[PDB]
Amino acid sequence: TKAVGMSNDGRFLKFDIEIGRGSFKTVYKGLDTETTVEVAWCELQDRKLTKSERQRFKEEAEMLKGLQHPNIVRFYDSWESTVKGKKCIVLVTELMTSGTLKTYLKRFKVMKIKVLRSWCRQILKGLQFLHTRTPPIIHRDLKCDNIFITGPTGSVKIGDLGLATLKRASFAKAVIGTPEFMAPEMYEEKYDESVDVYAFGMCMLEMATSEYPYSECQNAAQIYRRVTSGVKPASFDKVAIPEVKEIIEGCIRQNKDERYSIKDLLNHAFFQE
Numbered sequence: 001t002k003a004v005g006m007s008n009d010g011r012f013l014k015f016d017i018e019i020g021r022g023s024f025k026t027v028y029k030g031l032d033t034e035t036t037v038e039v040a041w042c043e044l045q046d047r048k049l050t051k052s053e054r055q056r057f058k059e060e061a062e063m064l065k066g067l068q069h070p071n072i073v074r075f076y077d078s079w080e081s082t083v084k085g086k087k088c089i090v091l092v093t094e095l096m097t098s099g100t101l102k103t104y105l106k107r108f109k110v111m112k113i114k115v116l117r118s119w120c121r122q123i124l125k126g127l128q129f130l131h132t133r134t135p136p137i138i139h140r141d142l143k144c145d146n147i148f149i150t151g152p153t154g155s156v157k158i159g160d161l162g163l164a165t166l167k168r169a170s171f172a173k174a175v176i177g178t179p180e181f182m183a184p185e186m187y188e189e190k191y192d193e194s195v196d197v198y199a200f201g202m203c204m205l206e207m208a209t210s211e212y213p214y215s216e217c218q219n220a221a222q223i224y225r226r227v228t229s230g231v232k233p234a235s236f237d238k239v240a241i242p243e244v245k246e247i248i249e250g251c252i253r254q255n256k257d258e259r260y261s262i263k264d265l266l267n268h269a270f271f272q273e
């Protein structure tokens, strides 16, 4: 029942109740004493950010805590924190006990077309909000396991904003767990909004197939070689609905200048109310 952690100002309490873990992260129940609203207390594994790097992140956190949109996970605050020999970055966000799209697909095996349409439209509204900030905010790591639902029949919210800074393409990655990948141009660290369109395409592909794209590869290097040569995931040919397949195809183009804009996707016949 007891508090097992606190922010310096006492606004946020940590409870010894584990919500889940995964990808350098453990998430606990917590409390905003200022509103009595329960929150998620996310503890991040530590790197060694140069204090060039650490200043960029505190700047980014300051930018991101000021944002509010119905399809973006609300972010409240971040700071460094110790227990024993471990230091971490704590991130406080709104609590989403219903979990992610990844978990949804596991539980319900398939996503029905009406749900896919509604939730993809919400993901697009979220991305459009980000891309129209001044200056634009690019997510850079959108995937089904960081898109959260408010309920099994609720709305979706984009999670993990701002965390992609810490994990560039130049950065060496152990071959363990599910292999990651990104839009082709991202590997060279020069890029823009369309990387989120490519990622959206891959999200929609996963929602339509209940498979992780490129499941046929065993490591990240294999996927790079295919993505940078325009070789699609095998799952693409398993998409049953032509209109869904066409949308995915128009998002996951190797050449960024050929990809759909967020505007054209929102205006697409598939997404009309």
Ligand SMILES: CC(C)(C)NC(=O)c1cncn1C1CCN(c2ccc(-c3nnc(C(F)(F)F)o3)cn2)CC1
Residues within 6 Å of the ligand: 019, 020, 021, 022, 027, 040, 042, 060, 061, 062, 064, 065, 073, 075, 078, 091, 093, 094, 095, 096, 097, 099, 100, 148, 158, 159, 160, 161, 162, 163
């Ligand atoms: C089952 C499991 C998957 C373990 N569940 C949850 O992880 C979970 C449960 N309830 C909530 N969660 C999630 C907790 C983690 N999430 C975050 C974290 C940080 C940020 C963020 N926004 N701006 C920044 C900035 F500026 F870079 F610091 O960071 C956005 N989302 C997404 C919700």
